[PDB]
RNA sequence: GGCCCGGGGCGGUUCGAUUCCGCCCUGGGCCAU
């Protein structure tokens, strides 16, 4: 019931058990058998390595070492090559170079390709990093390896475990190099509480300071932000989960929430109290990967949101979802109508020039002048956020993501109320309100 | 692909645009393992 009792019963959530390990063993056994029947240069990296891994989130990671001088195109062909021999069933799978991701012996497996080298310089892209990190990290980390799943665990239960786009939370390799300054899971959370948006983590160095902006700078390479892909947002989201755990311990912090499942009913009444205006832009979603569509959907999101506000509609927030089949753009305006006339500012009366000219745009209601100038009548094309949307979207389809905007721009209708709370939107929404339950 | 910094063109809107909404070529960097 006490902070180190918590984090007792909390390890049976993070740390595997023989089977998963055994599984892992066995695992990593017969992978290195083919992969030796091929001889090929392997490293194995990864929380696989390192004995890091998240209880029931086994996956052995596996980086061919290719020479300097090889070709990149040499390095996906090859690397493919032999991830395929290797693998009970490989897949092609896309990011940086591209890769394969398989099943050997019943567990996930990733074959990486990058060029093996002799001193963090002459490095070319992320994977090249890798192998240096394991290095680095490897005779640090033993002893502690618990701490670090614990950490996981932590922000995983929690959501920011990612440090893909589609999380933007806290890298695996980030969370192992805190625990390596930090010493425990306890300590990182305690000092984490007076962490802020200008915080600089320099663990080659020992030292914290101050920044420009949230910094974790890498032991081996001195100018990378290991942290980089974490929003702010998350950033403090985390800040205020160590405060609030430190306050009132708890397994809970270590269990994920469940998703709440709320009747379309109470939505829609909830809605209606708040006298909102809630709709939503359905599009077929792009054939990408999800770190290409979720910045889109991010950014298209924004766009949107920017042109409700300068239209005076007042939006609350915005949100966005992603199923199989489509994506949803969510926005709960407050103005659900507004009025067609508006005022526009004109020049300053004793500009004679401009207020002839601002004079001369013959409109249907005869401008006034208001404190030394003059202001005009003018009528709106649309009146309310759903109305004016239709007319950006189809306008401004280009402008929300290569392949976003094009989706949209092909199709795309706007969904409200009745008909939307059927839509596979409900937990986006609820969230965004801060519905309670 | 997204994001940050910089050029060269244009369009729309506006009394007035480098200054808003956008579009084209283009230089630099960052992220996603
Ligand atoms: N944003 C990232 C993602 C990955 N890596 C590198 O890739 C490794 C992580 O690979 P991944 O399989 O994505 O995660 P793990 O670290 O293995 O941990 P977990 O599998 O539990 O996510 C890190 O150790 C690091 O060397 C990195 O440096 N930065
Ligand atoms: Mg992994």
Do not use: C, I
């Given at each position: 019931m006490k902070v180190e009792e918590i984090l007792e019963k909390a390890l049976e959530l993070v740390i595997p058990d023989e089977e998963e390990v055994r599984k892992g063993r066995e695992a990593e056994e017969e992978l290195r058998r083919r992969l030796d029947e091929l001889g090929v240069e392997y490293v194995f990296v990864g929380s696989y390595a390192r004995n890091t891994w998240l209880k029931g989130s086994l996956e052995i990671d596996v980086f061919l070492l290719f020479p300097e001088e090889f070709s990149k195109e040499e390095l996906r062909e090859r690397g493919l090559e032999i991830g395929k021999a290797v693998l009970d069933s490989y897949e092609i799978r896309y990011a940086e170079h591209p890769y394969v991701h398989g099943v050997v012996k019943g567990v996930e497996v990733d074959v990486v390709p990058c060029y093996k080298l002799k001193e963090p310089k002459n490095i070319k892209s992320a994977v090249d990093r890798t192998p240096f990190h394991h290095k680095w990290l490897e005779g640090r980390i033993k002893g502690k390896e618990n701490e670090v799943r614990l950490l996981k665990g932590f922000l995983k239960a929690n959501g920011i475990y990612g440090a893909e786009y589609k999380v933007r939370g806290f890298s695996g390799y980030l969370c192992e190099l805190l625990i390596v300054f930090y010493g425990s899971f306890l300590e990182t959370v305690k000092n984490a509480?007076?962490?802020?948006?200008?915080t600089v983590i320099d663990v080659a160095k020992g030292e914290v300071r101050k920044g420009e902006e949230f910094f974790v700078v890498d032991p081996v390479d001195?100018?990378?932000?290991?942290?980089?892909?974490?929003?702010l947002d998350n950033l403090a989201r985390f800040v205020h989960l160590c405060r609030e755990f430190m306050e009132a311990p708890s397994l809970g912090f270590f269990k994920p929430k469940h998703p709440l499942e709320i009747e379309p009913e109470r939505l829609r009444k909830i809605v209606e109290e708040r006298g909102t205006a809630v709709f939503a832009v359905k599009f077929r979603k792009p054939d990408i990967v999800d770190d290409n569509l979720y910045p889109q959907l991010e950014r298209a999101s924004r766009k949107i949101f920017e042109f409700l506000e300068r239209e005076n509609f007042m939006p609350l927030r915005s949100a966005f979802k992603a199923s199989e089949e489509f994506c949803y753009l969510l926005f709960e305006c407050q103005i659900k109508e507004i009025s067609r006339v508006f005022r526009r500012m004109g020049p300053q009366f004793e500009d004679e020039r401009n207020v002839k000219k601002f004079l001369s745009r013959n409109r249907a209601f005869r401008p006034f002048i208001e404190n030394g100038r003059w202001w005009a009548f003018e009528m709106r094309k649309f009146t309310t956020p759903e109305e004016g949307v239709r007319s950006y979207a189809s306008t401004?389809?280009?402008?929300?993501?290569?392949n976003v905007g094009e989706s949209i721009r092909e199709y795309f209708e706007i969904i409200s109320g009745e008909k939307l709370?059927?839509?596979?939107?409900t937990a986006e929404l609820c969230e965004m309100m801060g519905v309670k339950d």
């Open positions: 509480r007076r962490w802020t948006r200008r001195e100018k990378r932000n290991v942290a980089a892909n974490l929003s401004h389809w280009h402008t929300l993501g290569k709370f059927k839509e596979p939107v």
